[PDB]
Design a protein around this ligand. Structure first.
Ligand SMILES: CC(=O)N[C@@H]1[C@@H](O[C@@H]2OC(C(=O)O)=C[C@H](O)[C@H]2O)[C@H](O)[C@@H](CO)O[C@H]1O
Ligand SMILES: [Ca+2]
Length: 474
C-alpha cells in the first residue's frame, strides 16, 4: 500500500498501527496508517493543537472533542462525507438508516456530515460509572454500609485511621479516582456532591456546572476531605494506573468509576488479597438527592477526512470497513483465536482476556491488542457483556431499576456563526475552572473568599454568551 497519515490519540496514547487489530485491518483494507502524533505525546488536546499548525493536515483526523472536530469541518479542514457515504460506504449508509438517532449525531447544523462519531452501544448500555466501596474493609472494622455523603465521610475516616488492611501502617487511601487529566479527576470527585464540571440540563435550561452553588459546596467539602487524608493525596498526579496500583496493593477503600472494569477486580485480586470485595452501592444521598450524573453519551469523539487527503473514496471505504460485521467485531473483540473464539457463530472471550494471569482487567488486555481504540466505530454491548462479571451485570440493572442515573446532555451542535465562539469560551472557562478547583481542593486560598471573583472571571470570559449558545442548541 501507499501510506495514510492519521492524527489519533486515546487515553494518553497515540494509535500504534502495528497493534494486531490494525495489522489485521491493514491486511483486510490495504490502508497502512502512519500516525503524526508521536509516541511521546500524552495529552490529546495539546497534540491536536500542535497538529493543526504542521502544514498539510493528515489524511484522517481523529479527535475526542467533537465540537472542535466539527468546527474544523465548518472551517474547511474536513470534507463533507454524506455523498462519499452514499456512493461508497454501504455499511455506514445502512447503519444510518437503522439508527436515526445516531444519524442525527453525525449531521452538523449546516446539514453536512463532517465526522463519523465513535458510538457507544447506547440503547443497550447507558450507565457508566458507579460507586464502589470495600465491603471487606467494612466487615473487618464493624461498620454499617454508608448510605449518605456524611456517613461515607465517617466510614472513610475509619478506613484512614483503623488500619483495615491490617499491616499496622497508616497507608490506606480511603477514596481514589482513575483519570489522566484534571477534568476527569473533577468528574469523579464532584458528582459525589451532586455537582458537575461540565454543562447539564435542568428543567429545560442548559447550565454550566462549575458556575453553580452545588459546585462551590462540592469543592469546599472536597477541600476538607482532602486535608483530612480521606481523598488520595496524589489524586492530581497519578494517571490511569491509579486504580490498578491502589487496589492491587490493598491501599484503596472506595472510588467512583466504570461499573464493568471496577467490578472485575474481585476476581482479579481474589488470590492476591483474600476476601477482596469491592462492592457497588447506589449513589450516596446528599440531603434527599440520590442521583448520579454519570451516564454514557451516544458517542465520544469521532474522525473525518481532511481537505488535504489525496484519495477520499478509499478512506471512506476504510471508514466503512469498521461498520461491516467483521470490521466491527475486530474493533470490539480483538483477534479470533487470540482474544476470542467463535462459539455457535458468536465471539466468546478467551482466558487471556477473562482471567489474565497478571492482574490485568479484561478491558486493559483488549486495549493492548488495539481493540476498543476510540476512532469512529460502533461499540457493541456484546463485547462488554462478554467480559463483565456477573456482579457487573447485576450492577447495570441495580442502577437502572433504582432510577438513580440522570441522562447525559445530548452532544450539542452549533451553527457556523457560533461554533468557533462557543468552543473558545468553553476552553478558556475550562482552564479557569480546572486551575481554581485544583488549587482549592489542595488547600490554597479560601473558596468562600474567592468564589465571586471566580464567577466574575467566567462571566468576563463569556459565560452568559456560552449559556445562550447552549440553550439555543438545546
Ligand atoms: C469510548 C471509550 O474508550 N471510553 C473510555 C472508557 O471505556 C469504557 O470502559 C468500560 C469499563 O471501564 O467498564 C466499559 C466500556 O465498554 C468502555 O468504553 C474508559 O473507562 C474511560 C476511562 O477514563 O475513558 C473513556 O474514554
Ligand atoms: Ca494499613
Amino acid at each position: 500500500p501507499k501510506e495514510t497519515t492519521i492524527f489519533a490519540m486515546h487515553l494518553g496514547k497515540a494509535l500504534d498501527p502495528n497493534l494486531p487489530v490494525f495489522v489485521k485491518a491493514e491486511k483486510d483494507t490495504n490502508i497502512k496508517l502512519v500516525n503524526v502524533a508521536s509516541q511521546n505525546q500524552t495529552d490529546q488536546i495539546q497534540a491536536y493543537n500542535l497538529m493543526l499548525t504542521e502544514g498539510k493536515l493528515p489524511d484522517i483526523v481523529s479527535y475526542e472533542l467533537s465540537a472542535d472536530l466539527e468546527n474544523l469541518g465548518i472551517e474547511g479542514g474536513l470534507i463533507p462525507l454524506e455523498d462519499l457515504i452514499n456512493q461508497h460506504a454501504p455499511n455506514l449508509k445502512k447503519f444510518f438508516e437503522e439508527n436515526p438517532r445516531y444519524k442525527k449525531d453525525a449531521v452538523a447544523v449546516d446539514g453536512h456530515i463532517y465526522m463519523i462519531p465513535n458510538y457507544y452501544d447506547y440503547f443497550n448500555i447507558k450507565v457508566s460509572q458507579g460507586y464502589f466501596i470495600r465491603q471487606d474493609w467494612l466487615e473487618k472494622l464493624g461498620l454499617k454500609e454508608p448510605r449518605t455523603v456524611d456517613e461515607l465521610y465517617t466510614t472513610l475516616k475509619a478506613f484512614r485511621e483503623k488500619d483495615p488492611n491490617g499491616n499496622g501502617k497508616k497507608d490506606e487511601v480511603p477514596f481514589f479516582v482513575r483519570a489522566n487529566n484534571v477534568r476527569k479527576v473533577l468528574t469523579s470527585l464532584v458528582d459525589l456532591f451532586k455537582a458537575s464540571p461540565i454543562w447539564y440540563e435542568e428543567n429545560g435550561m442548559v447550565k454550566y456546572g462549575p458556575a453553580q452553588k452545588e459546585f462551590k459546596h462540592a469543592i469546599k467539602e472536597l477541600s476538607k476531605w482532602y486535608k483530612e487524608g480521606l481523598i488520595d493525596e496524589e489524586i492530581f498526579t497519578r494517571g490511569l494506573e491509579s486504580r490498578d496500583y491502589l487496589l492491587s496493593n490493598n491501599l484503596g477503600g472506595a472510588t467512583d468509576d466504570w461499573i464493568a472494569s471496577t467490578s472485575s477486580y474481585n476476581r482479579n485480586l481474589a488470590d492476591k488479597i483474600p476476601g477482596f470485595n469491592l462492592k457497588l452501592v447506589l449513589p450516596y444521598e446528599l440531603n434527599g438527592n440520590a442521583k448520579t450524573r454519570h451516564a454514557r453519551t451516544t458517542y465520544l469523539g469521532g474522525w473525518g477526512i481532511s481537505k488535504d487527503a489525496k484519495d477520499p473514496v478509499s478512506l471512506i471505504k476504510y471508514f466503512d470497513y469498521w461498520y461491516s460485521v467483521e470490521g466491527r467485531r475486530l474493533w470490539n473483540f480483538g483477534i479470533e483465536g487470540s482474544e476470542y473464539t467463535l462459539v455457535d457463530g458468536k465471539p466468546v472471550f478467551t482466558d487471556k482476556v477473562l482471567k489474565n494471569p497478571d492482574g490485568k482487567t479484561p478491558l486493559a488486555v483488549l486495549r493492548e491488542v488495539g481493540a476498543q481504540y476510540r476512532l469512529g466505530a460502533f461499540q457493541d454491548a456484546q463485547y462488554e457483556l462478554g467480559w463483565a462479571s456477573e456482579s457487573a451485570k447485576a450492577g447495570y440493572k441495580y442502577y437502572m431499576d433504582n432510577d438513580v442515573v440522570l441522562d447525559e446532555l445530548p452532544i450539542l451542535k452549533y451553527t457556523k456563526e457560533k461554533s468557533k465562539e462557543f468552543v473558545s469560551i468553553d476552553t478558556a472557562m475550562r482552564a479557569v475552572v480546572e486551575e481554581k478547583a485544583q488549587q482549592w481542593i489542595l488547600g490554597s486560598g479560601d473558596i468562600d473568599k474567592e468564589w465571586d471573583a471566580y464567577i466574575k472571571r467566567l462571566e468576563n470570559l463569556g459565560l452568559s454568551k456560552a449559556e445562550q449558545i447552549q440553550n439555543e442548541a438545546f
